[PDB]
């Protein structure tokens, strides 16, 4: 479903290995969108129910469509919402292993929150995910202060936001089968990746 709050609603005795925190596109219902619930159920798939905690950034996050032209591609707000579901992750369960993700705003967010993360906090994601990244182009498809490898960024031909506009074009909703599959298994090679 669209809407997951694992983090949040878990218990600190009880922690999952695998911690995946999600940022939706503009207007999306729940937390977690169009995409989210697709790269959910894969992760559920590769390490089990009580093996990883699938969290939606909702709160502060409204996913506004006027917020995309802000500075940072999204507001404030949202960014302090996302720093503080990696504060609480971290805090909740230290020996957890982070993952996250986002879509078009979303992605803007995830780059944001990643960016001013402590870098100590930073080092525990593993990957992360973007799709119809609106700062692609500015941000040359990278997450500052983040490494590459750990960087996977999905921007169909065709889709003008990953090109510089605000545009949204038939490509940008296209983006389906990449949450299906190649996303959910570069986010589990990198998981497994680091636990060794
Ligand atoms: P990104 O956050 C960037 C928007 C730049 C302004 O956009 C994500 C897309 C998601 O698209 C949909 O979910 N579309 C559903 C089809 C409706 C017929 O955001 C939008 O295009 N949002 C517009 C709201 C619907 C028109």
């Avoid at 992360?128 to 609106?134: A, C, K, P, S």
Wanted: charged share 20%; aromatic share 6%; with cysteine.
């Amino acid at each position: 479903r669209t809407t997951r709050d694992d983090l949040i609603n878990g218990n600190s005795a009880s922690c999952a290995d695998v911690i995946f925190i999600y940022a939706r596109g503009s207007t999306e219902t729940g937390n977690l969108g169009t995409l989210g619930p697709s790269i959910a159920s894969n992760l559920e798939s590769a390490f089990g129910k009580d093996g990883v905690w699938i969290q939606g950034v909702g709160g502060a996050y409204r996913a506004t469509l006027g917020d995309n032209a802000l500075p940072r591609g999204t507001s404030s707000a949202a960014i302090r919402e996302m720093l503080g579901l990696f504060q609480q992750a971290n805090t909740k369960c230290p020996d957890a292993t982070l993952i996250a993700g986002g879509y078009s705003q979303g992605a803007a967010l995830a780059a944001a929150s990643i960016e001013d993360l402590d870098s100590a906090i930073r080092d525990k994601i593993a990957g992360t995910v973007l799709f119809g990244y609106t700062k692609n182009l500015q941000n040359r498809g990278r997450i500052p202060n983040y490494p590459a490898d750990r960087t996977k960024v999905f921007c169909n031909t065709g889709d003008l936001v990953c090109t510089g506009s605000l545009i949204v074009a038939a490509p940008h909703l296209a983006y389906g089968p990449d949450a299906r599959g190649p996303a959910p298994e570069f986010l589990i090679e990198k998981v497994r990746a680091v636990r060794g």
